[PDB]
Design a protein around this ligand. Structure first.
Ligand SMILES: CC(C)C[C@H](NC(=O)[C@H](Cc1ccccc1)NC(=O)c1cnccn1)B(O)O
Ligand SMILES: CC(C)C[C@H](NC(=O)[C@H](Cc1ccccc1)NC(=O)c1cnccn1)B(O)O
Ligand code: NA
Ligand code: NA
Lengths: 188, 196
């Protein structure tokens, strides 16, 4: 209907050739106390195991949020000033590092009250130095964005391939940096 | 945000170079250590008896902080975030000297030679302890375009002398790692110079 504050279109893949678009929602309020970060709708922990051994870690999605908050501090924001809540609606259990640029964009937008273009979808792992790192399932993700009525899709520079140029009816933007993501999507 | 070139082995003979990211900022509150990209806990055994422990990676981070403390740094003055990039859980004690160098470099600003990769467990006294997969690690350092690789002294063996096209530096201490990888910082608009 409109560009909007703290709503960003992310992308997911389930197995080789099955992509989808998720409408990630970000709320930022002046902190009650020390500031906080909460996420609804993500894996909190992953376990990988064999017969006799297994490891457990905080999820790549939760790790991704911590990278995002470190990047926003290097850019001169103070996330400790805010209680921040990110919501992946629907109740679907999602994981992975590839929503890093989308959550970062969502928080930036919510903090600055600058709406994000609703015609854009994006996928991109974020590094602590603001670089956009390659992701999985970029073709099914682009087709999901198109299939959903997105005019544009932001992908990491290193996911660029010749075959992408053969896709019609959606603008594919390759980015190296989170600043380039903000340039592409923020409205005024 | 500084980069240190760490090394990993996956199966008997495959190595990779990891660009480990280290962010160190003035503490927002009581200071903090956060690591992304690692195993945090390991369970070993069966139904009948199993143990659970902090991962080797997490233990390695605790040893790093103790060493920096014994060297007169106060890691609790900082919020420290180390990111091991991508989407594989990494584990092991062998990134001890990489994480310690990355934090050192970030605290003092004295930046890290980007042509150097390294592997080594760190002890509390700051000795560099032997690691596994030293040969595939060296080969992966070479393939990534590293000109130098730091290894533990006790990993030195005759056959490494057969490896061409990379300088292999054996170290006994963390101070030696820092002697070898730290570059003279820039000199412009400084009241004095720091030389290594
Ligand atoms: C937080 C989410 C949206 C990030 C994206 N996740 C996914 O695409 C993941 C697949 C993935 C890819 C790489 C690493 C781990 C898991 N997909 C899902 O979680 C998923 C998709 N559809 C239904 C239910 N779950 B990304 O890493 O590709
Ligand atoms: C923190 C990491 C980088 C330290 C290094 N780890 C690895 O090489 C470990 C194997 C290992 C070796 C010794 C003890 C435990 C596990 N490798 C990995 O975790 C690994 C390697 N390639 C891709 C993804 N993960 B080291 O202990 O050799
Ligand atoms: Na994504
Ligand atoms: Na290593």
């Amino acid at each position: 209907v409109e560009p909007q504050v703290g709503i960003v279109n992310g992308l997911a893949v389930y197995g080789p050739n099955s992509g989808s678009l998720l409408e990630i929602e970000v709320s930022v309020t002046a902190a009650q106390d020390k500031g906080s970060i909460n996420i609804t709708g993500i894996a909190e922990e992953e376990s990988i195991g064999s017969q006799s051994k297994s490891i457990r870690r905080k999820s790549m999605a939760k790790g991704s949020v911590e990278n995002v908050l470190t990047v926003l501090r290097t850019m001169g924001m103070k996330p400790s000033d805010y209680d921040i809540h990110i919501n992946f609606p629907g109740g679907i259990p999602i994981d992975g590092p590839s929503a890093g640029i989308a959550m970062a964009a969502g928080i930036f937008s919510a903090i600055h009250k600058i709406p994000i273009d609703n015609t854009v979808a994006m996928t991109g792992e974020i590094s602590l130095n603001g670089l956009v790192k390659p992701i999985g399932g970029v073709i099914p993700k682009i087709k999901a964005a198109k299939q959903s009525g997105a005019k544009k899709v932001i992908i990491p520079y290193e996911n660029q391939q010749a075959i992408l140029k053969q896709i019609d009816g959606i603008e594919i933007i390759a980015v190296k940096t989170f600043q380039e993501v903000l340039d592409e999507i923020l409205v005024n």
